[PDB]
Structures are given as C-alpha cells and as structure tokens.
Fold this protein.
Amino acid sequence: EMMSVSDGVMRLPLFLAMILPVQLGAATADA
Amino acid sequence: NHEMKKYTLFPSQFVIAAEHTVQAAYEAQREFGLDLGSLQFRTLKEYLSHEQ
C-alpha cells in the first residue's frame, strides 16, 4: 500500500510478440 | 473462424551475504597471513552462479 515497501507500485505489462497459425499442405500429387 | 489466447511471464529474486568478525580475522591474518574478506567475496560470487 505504501510506496517505500516497493510492493505498492501497480506495475504494467508488456506486449512482446504475437503468434500466427502455421501453413497447411500435403504432398500427394506424385501418384 | 479463429480464436486467440494469452500467456504471461514474471521473474524472481535471490539474496546472499557473508560475515566475518574482526578478532578472528586478525588472529587468522597474524597466524597464517590469509585474506578472509577476499576469500569470502570470491566464494559468494562463485556460489551465486553455481546454485542457479
């Protein structure tokens, strides 16, 4: 609750990165 | 359609200290000529990495 004890700070997060889905496919055209 | 999710991170802490008296330090320095302070500092620095 107090600023001196160093736990009363609210803190804020960070975004870092974002992950997108991987591609899809198959190799069956040889036959 | 598509859906999304979330994940989070947060770190931790550590602390370690060393202590040596004056009487015993002077006695050891007189008897053997060592250096308790340097030895303690080096042991602290080594063990800090070793434990992790």
Remarks:
- Chain B touches chain A at residues 2, 8 (CB under 8 Å).
- Residues 23 and 29 of chain B are 10 Å apart (CA to CA).
- The radius of gyration of chain B is 22 Å.
- Helices of chain B lie at 22-32, 36-51.
